[PDB]
């Protein structure tokens, strides 16, 4: 038998680890030399849809071509490759990707009701087939640098620099910068609430240099997490707009359970059967890392290659249309299999420390119209340089609320 | 005495029902034939009071201070409202007359005048697979017109989330036709959304989070439950089965449903008619100036009594013992980005079948941040 | 002791709401005091923005900005701003404020890596040193007046105006206006959730009249708090954005402690020496007010003057570089002094009841394009205005409007 107890208030503790990413994975001016064939084909696809009355690298097209499927005639539904001459958008018509495999002898569609989503998903798949062929230490160089992003930083009263952030390549968002990770330095504590004693940032989005067909949303991604824990920012993260001062008040809501003799959770990675592919980051155990390692294991066994959005064990290769032609078919098969998702859930233990950095988020315009000129003129000098604009700059404060913890804990009777 | 305990689970998780509304209830050019006289009178008032170029209850001026008064029949008394700003004068007077016009129009016609699901929804996408206007249920609300509910329809199994995060939740793009807004009723441009149980009434007029256009709104959420004990341990009910009040919302019991049902019933007692803002109770009529010419003052007195707890509703209705909540984390970003406007807006208007303005659109993401379901349980010792 | 936790909805007094403009002063009203500091701030920007390009050196010498250059560890050096004229921004170069005392025979630096932070903090100190010499009865006349701030107000369906708000002067933010404070009138109860029964405000930012080099965020400061408590806007307040309707759902979250036989907390302020108060009103006790009120005792012992951002005794003086030249350094010593921190934290004590108002924020564009031009014509006519100069603000109770944690023996 276990008895629960509850504690609430303010306590001095390590300030959360904050990870900053840009909403675009790459700098278009630095990666357009790889994507030019795909961009020319994407604009030809858009012209075929939008302006049909008006050569291309069809080796890209034949990987997963988009098809119109027209069912306006129940006795003769007809499927047509995109390549008056109008494509159908009536109530009986849908748009799909033809995912073919085994020398194309047997294959299936992935279906969309709308062209905007069909084109988004098609381009993401094709761009992934291109990025998976670039070595990661070169792929890092055509993403956003800490020099460009972190215009100013100040923690409490201590000045700060982009060299205070640990850098990782999170393949869906490119380079990400982690403040106060507590990995190779001692983590910073704080002992007072309010913005005056918190993290103060000014960030440059570089919005005009986005990849046009990937970066549909503009802002930074943010995530608060424990020291020495991996930032799964595609699940947990929030956005922040440019042109505003965003203020985030943090409260650490924690729930601590008893271990194996009382519940099936774990305090370590031990006696979990899944091989942890995030181990090379030296991070602490997490159910999220276990689930993704389980998926990447199934991927490496069924497709014979690993997917680009996940880490990779030492002997394997990422999936390419050049090396592994069937990869898109088998990857969609795995990605959509709910039985596979439940298998990983049934295989990974969850950790006994559940913790949530609860946030109250508020916003206002920044700079004011009166204090605009001199702030942008001075911000232009904060780098070795001018290429700056209001639509690019975020002002961001992160701080502890008056009560900064709520802990619920189990104890043995 | 009792023992509290906490059970946390990680497993595939049912998705809530999501009711989405436009802030504006009807496409104005469609209702303008009903509201033509009221628009004429309102623009005459603006031209008379403020020089703007542009019948039982007139608009008045006082020693400018602008207002109106709501009067009783069987005595000389009236409740007089005087506003220090013309915005409140005009908006509140217009809404009085608007609600007394719309209360007389039949529901069959109001449902046809408001938005269709194919108009409100440009795209929908759930669990990585396509979704369509046919996946939403109609919910007609008297102050927001046709609202539409995701993941709540008859004899279909509830949709469940087996993967957390933004990519596998509900993603929907909304068309918010702001050139067809009503000039005097609706002064805010966007949409509203409620997250609720499938058997729970959304009350989208009260507690809905608001969606801004030219923006992507990212509603990440966690699930938490609480289970109290009823009597002897607490004066609380698991169901509506042992409270004197009749429920009129055709939805599972909760304290606000009980309090509003009690008040709507007290109105059918005292004023002889039902308030149009709320569902119609059995065998009653909505209030309007021609059949119930003095209901304004009756409602004023009755609600003043309610706030002073003289009607008993607050002591008769009880808290519900089982409680489920989604703790939302709303956050916003600009959408489309200035580089993606070049192709997103053309393809979005092709998906409708003029070019869309960036401010006519809003993108909404609703997702479980993680599959962790917390619960707090109370049990006898 | 052991707690019990509960959540629900109940009729209760609506929060007190403090409304405050982001800029503390109207530039058109105060620029005659700040002229000689603005002329110097323009020159300080010339030597940073366009270094190849008359001064009041008495304003400069109070706390210069200096370049600290330590790229060459064998010979690190510090230089006053007053192969190139360019001040270095590279890694290893810091821009710092030279705080000094005793005819500059002792000094200390406040370090910044960024020039936008250094200039913001330099000006705010030099401005503060000027405001401290204006009597509050006159300094309150240079800030935004209530009748210009609150354009329209409506509580549920009760109309209100700027005269339903209590005026206070909070030196960091200028005039703030408090709704439903319960100080000179009975507080209003609210018995329903949702926006229709909440407080509805239309507010004017007056953005064209902000001070250029100070208070550089545009919006209204906002705080929800208890009746008869003083609003510490800085610590638990938020901003609200102009050009939008901001909707704020409120939940009253409480902790009730057991008291003396079990804990050191107090029922009211009668046990504690809170001598200094921000205003003449009979506000309630709070540990936050005690710590701030205690800091000023130690600063009036040590630096012989009280700080502008803090309360003041009945007969003492605010700090000026005219009367108290060393005050700028002396204040920075007190912030770092461990003895000062630990002695006030020892003197003050918690309250038995501990209430916090939690908020759920949402936003939408306002007005609608269809109502925009009659809205702004009416608001223009009634002052005898533009979208990004106006705020609309709704504050209302949530479906469950209280959460309580109660200690028991
Ligand atoms: C994608 O859509 C296509 C077309 O609607 C589906 O293909 C049809 O599936 C039914 C049921 O198996 C068959 O009877 C038809 O003959 C198919 N038509 C064609 C042209 O192949 C397909 O099943 C959908 N696939 C997915 C994964 O949604
Ligand atoms: C949206 O509604 C459609 C139609 O009710 C659903 O279509 C069914 O989807 C399942 C797989 O999820 C198929 O096995 C059925 O054959 C489909 N029926 C028809 C008539 O096509 C669809 O599942 C719904 N999608 C969501 C996300 O709710
Ligand atoms: C704002 O202040 C006015 C008074 O200046 C309040 O008006 C009074 O309200 C009470 C009821 O609460 C009446 O009995 C008085 O007769 C009213 N006086 C006048 C002169 O009208 C008004 O209620 C206040 N509004 C709010 C929302 O607080
Ligand atoms: C490694 C190092 O130099 N750390 C110092 C830190 O100890 C000090 O508190 C801070 C003050 O600005 O400056 C930096
Ligand atoms: C040349 C010089 O004195 N540089 C100072 C250094 O001594 C001091 O430790 C640091 C922290 O304030 O600031 C700088
Ligand atoms: C098509 O584009 C790819 C890059 O995406 C390139 O490697 C290939 O050589 C191109 N094919 C032709 C025929 O130009
Ligand atoms: C996990 O929870 C227990 C609860 O007592 C706590 O002691 C421990 O520090 C928490 N964290 C880890 C990493 O074990
Ligand atoms: C410089 O400014 C001070 C105010 O701080 C003023 O008293 C003095 O007269 C000014 N001197 C000159 C030369 O402008
Ligand atoms: C504190 O809370 C209790 C709750 O019953 C109340 O009676 C009391 O008046 C409140 N205030 C003080 C100062 O104790």
Swiss-Prot record, chain B:
Domain of life of the source: Eukaryota
Which reaction(s) does its UniProt entry say it catalyses?
A: Na(+)(in) = Na(+)(out)
Q: Where does the entry say this protein is expressed, by tissue?
A: Expressed in kidney (at protein level).
Entry GO terms, CC: apical plasma membrane; external side of plasma membrane; extracellular exosome; nucleoplasm; plasma membrane; sodium channel complex
Q: What is its main location?
A: membrane
GO BP terms, alphabetized: cellular response to acidic pH; cellular response to aldosterone; cellular response to vasopressin; intracellular sodium ion homeostasis; multicellular organismal-level water homeostasis; regulation of blood pressure; sensory perception of salty taste; sensory perception of sour taste
Describe the disease involvement stated in the record for this chain.
Liddle syndrome 2: A form of Liddle syndrome, an autosomal dominant disorder characterized by early onset of hypertension, hypokalemic alkalosis, and suppression of plasma renin activity and aldosterone secretion. Bronchiectasis with or without elevated sweat chloride 3: A debilitating respiratory disease characterized by chronic, abnormal dilatation of the bronchi and other cystic fibrosis-like symptoms in the absence of known causes of bronchiectasis (cystic fibrosis, autoimmune diseases, ciliary dyskinesia, common variable immunodeficiency, foreign body obstruction). Clinical features include sub-normal lung function, sinopulmonary infections, chronic productive cough, excessive sputum production, and elevated sweat chloride in some cases.
Record's family?
A: Belongs to the amiloride-sensitive sodium channel (TC 1.A.6) family. SCNN1G subfamily.
Tell me the protein's name: Epithelial sodium channel subunit gamma
Organism, scientific name: Homo sapiens (Human)
Lineage, top ranks: Eukaryota, Metazoa, Chordata, Craniata, Vertebrata
Positions spanned in the full protein: 80 to 521 of 649
UniProtKB/Swiss-Prot annotation, chain C:
User: What reactions does this protein catalyze?
Assistant: Na(+)(in) = Na(+)(out)
So which disease is it linked with? Answer: Pseudohypoaldosteronism 1B2, autosomal recessive: A form of pseudohypoaldosteronism type 1, a rare salt wasting disease resulting from target organ unresponsiveness to mineralocorticoids. The disorder affects multiple organs, and is characterized by an often fulminant presentation in the neonatal period with dehydration, hyponatremia, hyperkalemia, metabolic acidosis, failure to thrive and weight loss.
Oligomer and partners: Component of the heterotrimeric epithelial sodium channel (ENaC) composed of an alpha/SCNN1A, a beta/SCNN1B and a gamma/SCNN1G subunit. An additional delta/SCNN1D subunit can replace the alpha/SCNN1A subunit to form an alternative channel with specific properties. Interacts with WWP1 (via WW domains). Interacts with WWP2 (via WW domains); inhibits the channel. Interacts with the full-length immature form of PCSK9 (pro-PCSK9); inhibits ENaC by promoting its proteasomal degradation.
**Stated consequence of mutating residue 218 to V:** In a breast cancer sample; somatic mutation
Gene name in the database record: SCNN1B
Q: Kindly list the GO molecular function terms attached to this UniProt entry.
A: ligand-gated sodium channel activity; WW domain binding
Glycosylated residues? 164
The scientific name of the source species is Homo sapiens
Q: Which cysteines are joined by disulfide bonds?
A: 20-176, 88-93, 100-107, 153-160, 265-352, 290-348, 294-344, 303-330, 305-319
Q: Which keywords does this Swiss-Prot/TrEMBL entry list? A: Cell membrane, Cytoplasmic vesicle, Disease variant, Disulfide bond, Glycoprotein, Ion channel, Ion transport, Membrane, Phosphoprotein, Sodium, Sodium channel, Sodium transport, Transmembrane, Transmembrane helix, Transport, Ubl conjugation
Instruction: Indicate what this protein is called per its UniProt record.
Output: Epithelial sodium channel subunit beta
Portion of the parent chain present: 79 to 511 of 640
Please give the biological process terms from Gene Ontology that the record holds: aldosterone metabolic process; artery smooth muscle contraction; cellular response to acidic pH; cellular response to aldosterone; cellular response to vasopressin; epithelial fluid transport; erythrocyte homeostasis; gene expression
């Amino acid at each position: 038998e276990v008895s629960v107890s509850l504690s609430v208030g303010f306590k001095t503790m390590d300030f959360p680890a904050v990870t900053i990413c840009n909403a675009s994975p790459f700098k278009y001016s630095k990666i357009k030399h790889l994507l030019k064939d795909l961009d020319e084909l994407m604009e030809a696809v858009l012209e075929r849809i939008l302006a049909p009355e008006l050569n291309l690298n069809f080796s890209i097209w034949n990987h997963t071509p988009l098809v119109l499927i027209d069912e306006r005639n129940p006795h003769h539904p007809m499927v047509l490759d995109l390549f008056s001459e109008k494509i159908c958008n009536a109530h009986g018509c849908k748009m799909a990707m033809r995912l073919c495999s085994l020398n194309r002898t047997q294959c299936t569609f992935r279906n969309f009701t709308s062209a905007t989503q069909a084109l988004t998903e098609w381009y993401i798949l094709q761009a992934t087939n291109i990025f998976a062929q670039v070595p990661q230490q070169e792929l890092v160089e055509m993403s956003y640098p800490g020099e460009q992003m972190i215009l100013a930083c100040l923690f409490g009263a201590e000045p700060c620099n982009y060299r205070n952030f640990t850098s990782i390549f999170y393949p869906h968002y490119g380079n990400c910068y982690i403040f106060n990770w507590g990995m190779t330095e001692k983590a910073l504590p704080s002992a007072n609430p309010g913005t005056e004693f918190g993290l103060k940032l000014i960030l440059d989005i570089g919005q005009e240099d986005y990849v046009p067909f990937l970066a549909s949303t503009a802002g930074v991604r943010l995530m608060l997490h424990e020291q020495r824990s991996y930032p799964f920012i595609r699940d947990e993260g929030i956005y922040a707009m440019s042109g505003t001062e965003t203020s985030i008040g943090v409260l650490v809501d924690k729930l601590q359970r008893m271990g194996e003799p009382y519940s099936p959770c774990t305090v370590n990675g031990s006696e979990v059967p899944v091989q942890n592919f995030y181990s090379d980051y030296n991070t602490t155990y997490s159910i999220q890392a276990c689930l993704r390692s389980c998926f990447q294991d199934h991927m490496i066994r069924n497709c014979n290659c690993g997917h680009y959005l996940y880490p990779l064990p030492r002997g394997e290769k990422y999936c390419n249309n050049r090396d592994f032609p069937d990869w898109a078919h088998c990857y969609s098969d795995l990605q959509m299999s709910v039985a596979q998702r439940e298998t990983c859930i049934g295989m990974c233990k969850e950790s006994c420390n559940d913790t949530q950095y609860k946030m109250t988020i508020s916003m206002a315009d920044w700079p004011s119209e009166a204090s605009e000129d001199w702030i942008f003129h001075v911000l232009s000098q904060e780098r070795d340089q001018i290429t700056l604009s209001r639509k690019g700059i975020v002002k961001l404060n992160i701080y502890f609320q008056e009560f900064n913890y709520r802990t619920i804990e189990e104890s043995a009777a | 005495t009792v023992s509290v305990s906490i059970k946390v689970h990680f497993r595939k998780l049912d998705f809530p029902a999501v009711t989405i509304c436009n802030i504006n209830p009807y496409k104005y050019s469609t209702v303008r034939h009903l509201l033509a006289d009221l628009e004429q009178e309102t623009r005459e008032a603006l031209k008379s009071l403020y020089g703007f170029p542009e019948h039982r209850i007139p608009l008045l001026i006082f020693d400018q201070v602008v207002g109106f008064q709501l009067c009783s029949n069987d005595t000389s008394d009236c409740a007089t409202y005087t506003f220090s700003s013309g915005i409140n004068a005009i908006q509140e007077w217009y809404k009085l007359h608007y609600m007394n016009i719309m209360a007389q129009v039949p529901l069959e016609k109001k449902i046809n005048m408001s938005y269709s699901a194919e108009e409100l929804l440009v795209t929908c996408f759930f669990d990585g697979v396509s979704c369509d206007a046919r996946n939403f249920t109609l919910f007609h609300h008297p102050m927001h017109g046709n609202c539409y509910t995701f993941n709540n329809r008859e004899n279909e199994t509830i949709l469940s989330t087996s993967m957390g995060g933004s990519e596998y939740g509900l993603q929907v793009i909304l068309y918010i036709n702001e050139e067809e807004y009503n000039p005097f009723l609706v002064s805010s441009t966007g949409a509203k959304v409620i997250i609720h149980r499938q058997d729970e009434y959304p009350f989208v007029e009260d507690v809905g989070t608001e969606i801004e256009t030219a923006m992507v709104t990212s509603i990440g959420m966690h699930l938490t439950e609480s289970f109290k004990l009823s009597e002897p341990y607490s004066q609380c009910t698991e169901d509506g089965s042992d409270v004197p009040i009749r429920n009129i919302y055709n939805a599972a019991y909760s304290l606000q449903i009980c309090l509003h049902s009690c008040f709507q019933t007290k109105m059918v007692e005292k004023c002889g008619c039902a308030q149009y803002s709320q569902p119609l109770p059995p065998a009653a009529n909505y209030c309007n100036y021609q059949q119930h010419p003095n209901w304004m003052y009756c409602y004023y007195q009755l609600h003043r009594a309610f706030v002073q707890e003289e009607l008993g509703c607050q002591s008769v209705c009880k808290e519900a013992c089982s409680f489920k909540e989604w703790t939302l984390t709303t956050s916003l970003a600009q959408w489309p980005s200035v580089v993606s406007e070049k192709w997103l807006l053309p393809v979005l208007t092709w998906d409708q079948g003029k070019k869309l303005n960036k401010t006519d659109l809003a993108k909404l993401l609703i997702f479980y941040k993680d599959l962790n379901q917390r619960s707090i349980m109370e049990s006898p010792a």
